[PDB]
Every structure is written in C-alpha cells, then in structure tokens.
C-alpha cells in the first residue's frame, strides 16, 4: 500500500476487568429525587475488556482497525497527550464516506470525505536540540483528498504538545453511539493520579457533540503520534517513539441501569438490572435498601440449541410453462381449471419466465409462500380486458366479477395479471374470446356457466328468435394494437390453496435434516413452526388426520411425513424463580429458590 | 377450565394460534390481530381477577 514501520514486537493482548464505566445521561430531561429506568446502550458492570499497551519511553506500537458495533466505550489513561485522532469508515479505500476527527495543535478538524488511508496512518512531530519547540512533520494519514461531504475547522489555539515521562495523570472517557444516523459523542475528563491498571470510582458523563451525519460506519481506528529527536537512530522507517499511555476499547450492549438522581440532578449511583438477584430486587423495587422477604422473578426458560427441519421428500417440480405465459387460453365465462399437486412449488421461478404486471395474494404474504405447505392448488386461468382487471378482487363490484367469475369474501389465494399483446392481438381483431353481458341471477363461488340461451331484458317473450328486448349474452371483445393500453388483453390466473387444513404434499423446497429427541429445540412440520421436545407417543391416529388438538387448542401430537410416526410436543417453559433476602443492612447474600 | 378454553377463542380473527398467524402473514400486517387478541385476553384476565 504505502509505507510501514519495522521492529514492532507486538505483545499478545490481555483481558482485564472494568469498574463501573459507561454511565451517561439518557436524554436532555432533568430528573431530581426520582429513580427512572431507561433502555439505551451502556456497558455491563464487571465486564471483561481488552487492554492494549503503548509504552515505549519497550518497543510497543499496535493500533489495528476495530469493528464498530452498537456503541463504543474508549478509555484513555495519558500524561502527555499520546492519543491523537480517530477515523471511522467501512472499507477505507476511497470508495466510502470516511470520517476523520483530529485534534491538531492548531485546530480541531472534522472531515467527512473519501480519504485514501494507508496500512499504518499516524502523525509525528520533531523536537530540536538547539531550540525548544514542538513542530509537526510526518503526516502519514491520507495521500490525497478529492471528494468531501462535510468539513469543520475549530478556532485557532495554542497547544503545549507535552512529551514527559512518569505516571498517568489524565483520564479521558468517550462514548460513541449512532442513532438514526445521528452520531453522538460524549466526552469526560478526569485529573487522576495513579501508576497503571484502571482507576476505580464513579463519575458522570457529559455530552460532547451530536453530528447529524448519515453514513454507514462499520469499523474505526485510532491514530496516535510519534516523537523524533536525538534518541532516534536517524531514520523515519525504523526509529519511532510511541510514548507511554494506555487505552481500553469496549463494546456497548443494550442493558438497563437505574440511576440515582439527587437534588442537584446529577447521576451519582448506577444499579444494574440483570446481574445479581439483589440487583434485580433493587431494580424492581426502585430503591436501594431491600427489606427482609421473598420476591418472585422471571420464569425459567431453556434456550434452544438446534433446529430440525422435517419435510417429505418430493422430487417432481410443478410445471410453470403451461400455467404462466403459455400459448392460448379460454374465455372468461369458461375459465381453464388446473390441478397442481405432488410437486414442489416456488415463486422465485416465475420472475425469469415472463415479466408480469400485477401480483397480489389475499390472506397470505407473497414472500412467505415457501415457508408453508400448499394444500389443493387450483389454477383458474382466463383472459380479460384491461378495463376490468380491478374488478377481479374479493370485495368489488362490476359485471365481470358478478356474471362470470366469483370470489368469496374470505378467499385466501394469489392473483396474477399480465399483458399479452404479442399473441392475443391481431391486425384485424381477435374474435376468439367471449364474455357474458347480463344474467338473471348471480353466480356461486367457483362455478362455470356455459348457458348459451337467449337472454330476456324485460317484456316481450323471445322463444328463441332474438327480437325485441332479446339480446345475446356472449359478446366479443376488440383486442387491437392500434387502441390504448386499457383495450389490450390481459391474462389473469388465480391460484387458490389451503393453509394447514388437510394432509397434502406440495410444501416447499426446504430439505429435511436429522432428528434429535429429549431436547427443547425448534421444529417445523408442514409449514407449522414450534418449539419444544418431541417425545415418543403411544396413541392411535387415523389415516386422514395429521395434526392433533386437545382442549387447549394446541398441536399436541404431530405425524412425521417420512417415518410416519406420532410425536408428542412438550414445552419446557415450566418453573418459577424466587429470591429470598434477609435485608440490605444485614448482609449482601441472598437465596435462590426453584419452585 | 374457562381460562383454558379462552385460548381457543378468536375475538374476531381467523385463528387462535399465534404461530399459525405469524407463519401465514407478514409481521407488518398481523399487528392489529395481535392487538385484538391481547386486548381480549387482558379483558378476560381482568374479569377473572375481579
């Protein structure tokens, strides 16, 4: 890529423990003498974080790229300003809007652009011997900055640029969050005095900035600085001096902390809501001194370990060539009825066949067809005019939906409608499709009417001669390419099926796996999903029943589509948890009781 | 027994099984049915507690 440094004995990272860190304000609401619980992104107490060293005054300089999760907690123990800037991005290759926040000795620069970062970007000042001055020299961050989206430069100031040695004297805590594109940074400074490790105690976190940006931040990195003077061998490729400071990076989790608001309105105490039973009691009672007694908590739940899939082995595939976009269909008064069964159905094999115009499934989601098992697939195909497409819907009026095809109110099925002008349109007109004008009565759902008798408008009996008030019901359309869009023919296919009603065999392409018993795991049978234990049964079923329901109206027994065995479903969520406490002033230990 | 049988009622829906509804319809559409079921069960529990 660019340039790199040699002689970097990177020590293996170590794991350390925190001491109540990451307690900020939930919002801009003042609270006093009131205990309120929020649900944001905090850091769990007594958590395990990673400790990265950077002391050199030996030979330690490691600052890799870390993935940006939901909230980042960055602690920095320094004494001479070692941590410099921060970068946020995703790929870092001049193809993603990268954010760079640097605290230069003259200005604080914040640039949302498209930088080209190297393998090891950093800064480096030079210290002279004849004169005491700290000037910046090496700036190995980006090679060129072309496009940008945001630029902010702070006021010119004077920075001392420290570089002494000793013990840690400053602690900087930063909390980064991203909510609806808004990047919120909270900063806190503390003038402590200790050797190493991590200082304890509790302190509030004041907000710093809230940038209303809108980028996709995936990873981040921290750029430090190097000191070059008379201690360096005399080159910028191998000699370097990181300094002597420590930094801890941790990921925030959606926890719940109860804060103690006094008369001043500042957070002086934080209690966890999910760690110890005493902490849970203090969270529930919204207090600190729990009296002697017993309290019921959440029920015991077993987390699933595996997930078995059960479906019958079906090899045949449902033909969609003659169903969708074939060659010649019937009219509207005598629609074509087709039966589809004993094959694997799928909707992802329809977009590549022909580009449709309208697709709507009433009573079932269009993207959840493969997650269920179809039952009795009836395809009603016909060809109508573009001016009567909206009439074909469960709950509409008109003439075509009343004197030809009927849809029930509680109809659960899909309807597809696509234009067909390449074949159903002639230069002189297509007179092969007929439609019924009027009718004496209505039509029952799913009924074919092939009555070719003389219709009677009012008075004057016809007696088969076609005279006054004696019109013919079957009339022709007028499919011609010289007309508009509404006059073009449209092929409409209605697919009707049942969802968990009779033991069918359509289902989807979901293959079956293994089978494990005596475990509370997930399972799927004929599209019906459940969670529990599948134990052996001893009852006798009937050769036309699949699922079984008792008094509680739940799936008690299930028949396997392959082994043809009956398995009983048993839930594992059964148990109570209680915490017995003798008092806060007495002791801090409690007792756990399982009912 | 009445509280057990209350789980079989529909309260103006299509079924009483939550998994059956979640497997047949998308989440951004069964919210009204879930709310109606929750309201009916809460009313039944309130009557039982009274």
């Amino acid at each position: 890529q660019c340039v790199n440094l040699t002689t970097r004995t990177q020590l293996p990272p170590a794991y350390t423990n925190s001491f109540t860190r990451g307690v900020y304000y939930p919002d801009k609401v003042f609270r006093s003498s009131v205990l309120h619980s929020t649900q944001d992104l905090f850091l769990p107490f007594f958590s395990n974080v990673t400790w990265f060293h950077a002391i050199h005054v030996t030979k330690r300089f490691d600052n890799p790229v870390l993935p940006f999760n939901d909230g980042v907690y960055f602690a920095s123990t320094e004494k001479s300003n070692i941590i410099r800037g921060w970068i946020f991005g995703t790929t870092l290759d001049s193809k993603t809007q990268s954010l760079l926040i640097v605290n230069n000795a003259t200005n604080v620069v914040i640039k949302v652009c498209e930088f080209q970062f190297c393998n090891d970007p950093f800064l480096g000042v030079y210290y002279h011997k004849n004169n005491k001055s700290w000037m910046e020299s090496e700036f190995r961050v980006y090679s060129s900055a072309n496009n940008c989206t945001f630029e902010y430069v702070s006021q010119p100031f004077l920075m001392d640029l420290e570089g002494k040695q000793g013990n840690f004297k400053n602690l900087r805590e930063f909390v980064f969050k991203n909510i609806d594109g808004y990047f919120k940074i909270y900063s806190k400074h503390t003038p402590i005095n200790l050797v190493r490790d991590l200082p304890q105690g509790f302190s509030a976190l004041e907000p710093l900035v809230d940038l209303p940006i809108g980028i996709n931040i995936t990873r981040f990195q921290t750029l430090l600085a190097l000191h070059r003077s008379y201690l360096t061998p005399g080159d910028s490729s191998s000699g370097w001096t990181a300094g002597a400071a420590a930094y801890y990076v941790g990921y925030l989790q959606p926890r719940t902390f109860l804060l103690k608001y006094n008369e001043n309105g500042t957070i002086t105490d934080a209690v966890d809501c999910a760690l110890d039973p005493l902490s849970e009691t203090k969270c529930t009672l919204k207090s600190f001194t729990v009296e002697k007694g017993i309290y019921q908590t959440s029920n015991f739940r077993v987390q699933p370990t595996e997930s078995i899939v059960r479906f019958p082995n079906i090899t045949n595939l449902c033909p969609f060539g003659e169903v969708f976009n074939a060659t010649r269909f019937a009219s509207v008064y005598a629609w074509n009825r087709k039966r589809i069964s004993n094959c694997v159905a799928d909707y992802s094999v329809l977009y590549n066949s022909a580009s449709f115009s309208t697709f709507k499934c009433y009573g079932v989601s269009p993207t959840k067809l493969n997650d269920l098992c179809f039952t009795n697939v009836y395809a009603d195909s016909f060809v109508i005019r573009g001016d009567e497409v909206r009439q074909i819907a469960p709950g509409q009026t008109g003439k075509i939906a009343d004197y030809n095809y009927k849809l029930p109110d509680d109809f659960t099925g899909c309807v597809i409608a696509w234009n067909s002008n390449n074949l159903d349109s002639k230069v002189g007109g297509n007179y092969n499709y007929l439609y019924r004008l009027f009718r004496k009565s209505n039509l029952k759902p799913f009924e074919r009417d092939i009555s070719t008798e003389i219709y009677q408008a009012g008075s004057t009996p016809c007696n088969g001669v076609e005279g006054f008030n004696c019109y013919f019901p079957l009339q022709s359309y007028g499919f011609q390419p010289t007309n508009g869009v509404g006059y073009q023919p449209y092929r409409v296919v209605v697919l009707s099926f049942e969802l968990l009603h009779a033991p069918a065999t359509v289902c989807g392409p979901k293959k079956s796996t293994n089978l494990v018993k005596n475990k509370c795991v997930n399972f799927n049978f004929n599209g019906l999903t459940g969670t529990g234990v599948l134990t052996e049964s001893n009852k006798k079923f009937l050769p036309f029943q699949q699922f079984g329901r008792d008094i509680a109206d739940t799936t008690d027994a299930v028949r396997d589509p392959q082994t043809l065995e009956i398995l009983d479903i048993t839930p594992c969520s059964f148990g109570g948890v209680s915490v017995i406490t003798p008092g806060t002033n007495t002791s801090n230990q409690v007792a756990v009781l399982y009912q | 027994n009445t509280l057990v049988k209350q789980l079989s009622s529909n309260f103006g829906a299509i079924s009483s099984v939550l998994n059956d509804i979640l497997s047949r319809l998308d989440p951004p559409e069964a919210e009204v049915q879930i709310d109606r079921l929750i309201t009916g069960r809460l009313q039944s529990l309130q009557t039982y507690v009274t």
């Binding site: 008792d550 008094i551 509680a552 839930p571 969520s573 059964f574 109570g576 009912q595 | 509280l3 057990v4 789980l7």
Partner: peptide
C-alpha cells in the same frame, strides 16, 4: 399414619389437566 383421629379421617375422605393448566401460566 398421620396425627388425626377417626372422625377427622372420615371428614377428610368426603372432601375431594394439571400440567395442561400449568403450561400456560396458571400455577398453584
């Protein structure tokens, strides 16, 4: 077997689904 008498034993005998109810929150 317990610490009761004969009249108490007679009265106790005159006074007289569980998992199906417990598997839905209804606990005892």
């Amino acid at each position: 077997p317990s610490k009761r008498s004969f009249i108490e034993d007679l009265l106790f005998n005159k006074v007289t689904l569980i998992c199906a109810q417990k598997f839905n929150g209804l606990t005892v």
